[PDB]
Structure 1
Amino acid sequence: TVPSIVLNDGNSIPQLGYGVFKVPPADTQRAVEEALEVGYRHIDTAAIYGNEEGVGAAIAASGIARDDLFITTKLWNDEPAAAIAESLAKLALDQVDLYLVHWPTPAADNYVHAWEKMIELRAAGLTRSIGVSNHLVPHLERIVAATGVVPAVNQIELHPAYQQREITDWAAAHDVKIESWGPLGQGKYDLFGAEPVTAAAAAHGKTPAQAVLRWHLQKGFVVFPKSVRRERLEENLDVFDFDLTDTEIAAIDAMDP
């Protein structure tokens, strides 16, 4: 099953979650109920852009203890507070488990302020944990030095061809968990056809997608494979029954230059 990762604030998070994806608002409830039945307990609603009413309905009708669920969401575009408050209403929840704000600005003149706001959100109990996205080592050092609060999570683009090692190393050194955004390259390159990928799939009797997912997992990363078809939901979840060897992992790691 899905292992629970330790967050720096005392909370634990299921390593693999369901990313609500490609679902019109009316079918959202049904989709989440399906993920719940499959076995997912970690839900990420980012991709639905605030169309969370259906998510709330599913949770409410699920029968699952609040404490057994992990609700994640992110602010896309002074407004995290307004944003989260609205989401809470839609979700019919007192708080979410994890809240993340957007990539720092090219102007880099507000990410600190943004972090201060997140800290207040947390203090206000709107979210149990606070994290960031696309924060580089310098961004991270800056917010920590400025606020004294270390993010629980840092969401960054991550896949074999692009690993952002500086970030992951730093994170590991400071107890920050990494969430792999676009874990499978987003179909931008031939990931499934890569020798290191096919080789692992073949050896373990898994699919290439599965092998890659496993790679992230063994590396200690948090992932939200964006599933649509039940078949995929299933496969995406069934990646805890095998282990890539150290050699298998290194071959994949070598995919980046």
Structure 2
Amino acid sequence: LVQRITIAPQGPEFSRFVMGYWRLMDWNMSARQLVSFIEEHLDLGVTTVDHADIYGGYQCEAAFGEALKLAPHLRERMEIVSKCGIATTAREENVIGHYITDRDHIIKSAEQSLINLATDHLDLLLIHRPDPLMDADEVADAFKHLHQSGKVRHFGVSNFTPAQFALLQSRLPFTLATNQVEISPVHQPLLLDGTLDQLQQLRVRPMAWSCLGGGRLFNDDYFQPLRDELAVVAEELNAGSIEQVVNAWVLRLPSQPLPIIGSGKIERVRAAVEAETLKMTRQQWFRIRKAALGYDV
């Protein structure tokens, strides 16, 4: 199967690869088609699922839920991850995209997740983004409430800078279980700004998402050189696809990030998990890396 990994000190055990339902709507899938899509990725080994507040105009959690309703026994076999803290214009209350990391709202979204997902509990809850107006005390007070009722068992953050992660962390009696961030050849800032070193140092493993199926290639020649490099390295490793070379590039990071998969086909999901068997050489990591950038060192 897929390797199992404890995301943090007092944290939970997750599957190295997580299924992300960011684009569940795009898949034009039906409830009985999802219960079977799930089972198939659950059987592959991918048992951790990534959901969020605003994903799909506040529809994805609901959709997933309908399916969880068809096979209620599927919960035990999985670990659910959801988020809150973001306010999109998909709602009329939000004329502008702003953040909301206030107590009641975090409790609100949390409890709304349980309902939409048709579950009595979330394995992990993350503050979607760092809000300039975030008050670590207020958030930490929200977490204490959700935890006190067994509604949420582990807490985390997403897209937090070392400084923000440390701020919120100085207020919680429990260990932030992760910092879900964006990591890939096309987006490597997190590799040098301290974010991944803090994670490795604290032994907290990052859930990594890479806008893959987005098509951020072939239509932005800025990264043609990376396209050409991910292509040759792919043959060298005799991999199934360049996307597979990308998943393995992330897996090599010393922080041991858990790559998030965004696809609607078990076969591509299988191929993604197959990245755990590519023997990428340091030289191949740097060569990929360098082509995305354009220089050495």
The alignment's TM-score, normalised by the length of structure 1, stands at 0.85
Aligned twin of 1:130: 155
Give yes or no for contact 1:33–1:62 (8 Å, CA) kept in 2. no
Of 25, 29, 51, which residue of structure 2 is paired with 1:45? 51
Aligned twin of 2:251: 217
Q: CA RMSD in A?
A: 2.8
Aligned twin of 1:88: 114
Is residue 2:197 matched to residue 1:161? Answer: no
* Alpha-carbon separation, structure 2, partners of 1:199 and 1:111: 47
* Alpha-carbon separation, structure 1, partners of 2:14 and 2:236: 30
Measured after TM superposition, the shift of residue 73 of structure 1 is 1.2
**Bigger radius of gyration:** 2
Aligned twin of 2:272: 236
* Alpha-carbon separation, structure 1, partners of 2:252 and 2:151: 31
Aligned twin of 2:80: 71
Aligned with 1:96: secondary structure?
coil
The alignment's TM-score, normalised by the length of structure 2, stands at 0.74
5+ residue gaps, structure 2: 88-102, 218-222
Of 219, 228, 234, which residue of structure 2 is paired with 1:201? 234
* Alpha-carbon separation, structure 1, partners of 2:208 and 2:114: 25
* Alpha-carbon separation, structure 2, partners of 1:185 and 1:221: 19
Aligned twin of 1:33: 36
Measured after TM superposition, the shift of residue 132 of structure 1 is 0.4
Aligned with 1:100: secondary structure?
strand
Quick one: which amino acid aligns to residue 250 of structure 2? H
Q: How many residues align?
A: 256
The worse-fitting range, judged by mean Cα deviation, of 81-90 and 119-128 is 119-128
Give yes or no for contact 1:42–1:69 (8 Å, CA) kept in 2. yes
Give yes or no for contact 1:104–1:110 (8 Å, CA) kept in 2. no
Aligned CA distance change for structure 1 residues 85 and 193 (closer, same or farther; 3 Å): same
Aligned with 2:154: secondary structure?
strand
Aligned with 2:116: secondary structure?
helix
Is residue 2:25 matched to residue 1:23? Answer: yes
Give yes or no for contact 2:83–2:126 (8 Å, CA) kept in 1. yes
Aligned twin of 1:110: 135
Quick one: which amino acid aligns to residue 177 of structure 2? A
Q: Percent identity?
A: 21
